[PDB]
Design a protein around this ligand. Structure first.
Ligand SMILES: CC1CCN(C(=O)NC2CCCCCC2)CC1
Ligand SMILES: CC1CCN(C(=O)NC2CCCCCC2)CC1
Lengths: 193, 193
């Protein structure tokens, strides 16, 4: 049942490594999952809905990992604290590059994908701003920019920079340098005056 | 001649304030420019080519303004130097929000738009890295990250942050706060250790 569903999702993620969603058919997804086309339509209204589900899965996986970290602080300095946090997104999305790539593109096209992305970005920015505020309250960070505005720009930076790196865009930061690059900018901008 | 061309471009930019390129027809562009459909096809192969030209115009306008600034340094501190530079992009793209919005979306869709964007981003990143290197050479900035990598991430930040603000995305930095926010992050990340 949800085995067929998981087979459909696994096929879609596998096929998206080779080509865009536009060049993948329902017949392609049905074939890979070992089901018929009408049986596919039982589980999903469209190939677009398959992608929405795959992205939902990835975004929630990142979110849950961040929640785990938030409840279980590593015992480090401020630089390492932010690095471990950014690393949740680097590893999670980085482990699902085809879904990430297809899901970012689908924002143009799909109100549900746009809203999914928007919902979680708002949550991650709010969490970021809450940590910056805590750092200021404890006297570890100076009161410079509005924390929510700073958080917004830094999150958008990470979105654009991580995804360009993963896609091998020209220009992009090399994937093996993107974590150090982002951590530098986060730490200097959050702690600097 | 190039009056009809300019009328076509002016119509397209006007129409793009109201709706996406998908909901604009060649017949729409011909009508607004006071020409027939075949006369349109004389000047442009497609509505897509009209957008490519409008974006080319905007991107070159920004580039030329930056070149002017590069030849004519304002006499200020380092914060103001970067602010004036970022402001070229804020004002130029900000004066053409519909073209910016449509042109960013067309990257998914159009190899020529993707390459145009890529070419100029590479140029602006190289210029950014050259200024950071000059600042380090003069002893004004510390030798932290690889300057080209730092430049890349900061440029990508500006791309994503400016365009989210202009489009009124959720989330976004308010347009009236985006310049201060970006300048802060640029200055702290370039001069901070
Ligand atoms: C404590 C924070 C939470 C937010 N962080 C992020 O990297 N968020 C971004 C990840 C890139 C992909 C899009 C989402 C924004 C840093 C750690
Ligand atoms: C001396 C630098 C040159 C580059 N700068 C930029 O803002 N570039 C970005 C502008 C946003 C739109 C996309 C292009 C990247 C800062 C000033």
């Amino acid at each position: 049942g949800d085995d067929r569903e998981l087979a459909i999702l696994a096929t879609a993620e596998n096929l998206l490594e080779d080509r865009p969603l536009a060049d993948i058919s329902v017949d392609d997804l049905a074939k890979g999952a070992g089901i018929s086309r009408p049986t596919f339509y039982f589980y999903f209204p469209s190939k677009e809905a398959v992608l929405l589900t795959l992205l939902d899965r990835v975004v929630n996986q990142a979110d849950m990992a961040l929640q785990t970290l938030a409840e279980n602080p590593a015992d480090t300095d401020r630089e390492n604290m932010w690095r471990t946090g950014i690393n949740v997104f680097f590893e999670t999305f980085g482990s699902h590059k085809a879904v990430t790539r297809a899901g970012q593109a689908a924002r143009a096209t799909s109100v549900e994908v746009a809203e999914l992305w928007s919902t979680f970005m708002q949550k991650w920015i709010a969490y970021t701003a809450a940590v910056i505020d805590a750092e200021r309250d404890r006297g570890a960070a100076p009161r410079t920019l509005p924390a929510h505005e700073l958080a917004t720009a830094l999150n958008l930076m990470n979105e654009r920079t991580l995804f360009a790196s993963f896609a091998g865009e020209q220009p992009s930061v090399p994937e093996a340098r993107v974590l150090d690059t982002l951590v530098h900018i986060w730490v200097t901008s959050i702690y600097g005056e």
